[PDB]
Write a protein that binds this ligand. Structure first.
Ligand SMILES: C[S@@+](CC[C@H](N)C(=O)[O-])C[C@H]1O[C@@H](n2cnc3c(N)ncnc32)[C@H](O)[C@@H]1O
Ligand SMILES: N[C@H]1C[C@@H](O)[C@H](O)[C@@H](O)[C@@H]1O
Ligand code: SF4
Ligand code: SF4
Length: 246
């Protein structure tokens, strides 16, 4: 029986305020849009609770989590249902004030992965520079120039263990409508594994499609998948839970 995912990334809202040249938002729109139905997030929390999920949970796919109107609710529910899990927010930081950071931290966020992206310098620069140490220690502050740019499953043409990949052995994405993907690169949802409104995520994780896919990619057979065949992402090649990889 395959190990449960150690990481789950939830699309609590589909939209972003930016259109980075190295992001599919610059060239396509998400095929699902909106904010996650609170009842669906509750269903996800019930399922993760039933598994004693204690890995990383994050709140983005290709949108900006601080735009989620129910972010406070969802972070609070995370702490209530899966107190052993590690909530980590990746954010462009454009909306991240000190007050916002502190509210989120109090509700359960353990780390913020904040990236200053191409274009306008955000106000978080000055906020970060003024943060007390205890808050500052909770932030990994990246520039987009620090990222190891992936072509996002071959969507981006302007972007140039070997080929092994462990993402689908370690991680699941839940889209805003509850569809489960095996990788965060699957912007176009080429590999929907199931929907958590119809099946328990554990059963989806362990189904033949998902089990076969993760074995295939562990062996480095990217060529056998429309999702992976042109993918240049080699950042996740071990079995370990991570907070972030560049
Ligand atoms: C798709 S972004 C989504 C969350 C939020 N919108 C943000 O930018 O932080 C998830 C993470 O991937 C990083 N990222 C964006 N484009 C990337 C790319 N082409 N290759 C690798 N990482 C990328 C972002 O900086 C962010 O840390
Ligand atoms: N390098 C980043 C890329 C991001 O899209 C994934 O969601 C995150 O898990 C990774 O750590
Ligand atoms: S801020 Fe994040 S989601 Fe938005 S366009 Fe840039 S990389 Fe994509
Ligand atoms: S090869 Fe690329 S698209 Fe396929 S699972 Fe790995 S990171 Fe995702």
């Amino acid at each position: 029986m395959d190990k449960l995912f150690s990481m789950i990334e939830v699309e609590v809202n589909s939209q972003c305020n930016r259109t980075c040249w190295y992001c599919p938002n610059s060239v396509s729109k998400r095929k699902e849009t909106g904010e996650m139905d609170p009842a669906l997030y509750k269903t996800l929390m019930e399922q993760l609770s039933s598994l004693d999920f204690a890995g990383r949970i994050s709140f983005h796919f290709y949108g900006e989590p601080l735009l989620c109107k129910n972010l406070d609710l969802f972070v609070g529910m995370t702490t209530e249902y899966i107190p052993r899990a590690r909530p980590i927010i990746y954010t462009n930081g454009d909306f991240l004030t000190e007050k916002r950071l502190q509210t989120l931290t109090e509700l359960g966020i353990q780390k913020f992965i904040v990236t200053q992206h191409a274009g306008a310098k955000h106000k978080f620069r000055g906020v970060y520079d003024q943060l007390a140490g205890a808050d500052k220690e909770k932030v990994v502050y990246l520039d987009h120039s620090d990222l190891v740019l992936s072509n996002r499953g071959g969507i981006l043409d302007n972007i140039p263990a070997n080929m092994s990949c462990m993402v689908p052995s370690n991680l699941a994405v839940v889209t805003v409508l509850g569809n489960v993907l095996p990788c965060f690169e699957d912007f176009n949802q080429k590999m929907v594994m199931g929907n958590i409104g119809e099946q328990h995520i554990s059963d989806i994780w362990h189904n033949d499609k998902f089990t076969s896919f993760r074995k295939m990619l562990k062996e480095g057979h990217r060529g056998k998948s429309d999702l992976c065949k042109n993918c240049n992402n080699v950042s996740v090649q071990t079995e370990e839970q991570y907070d972030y990889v560049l």
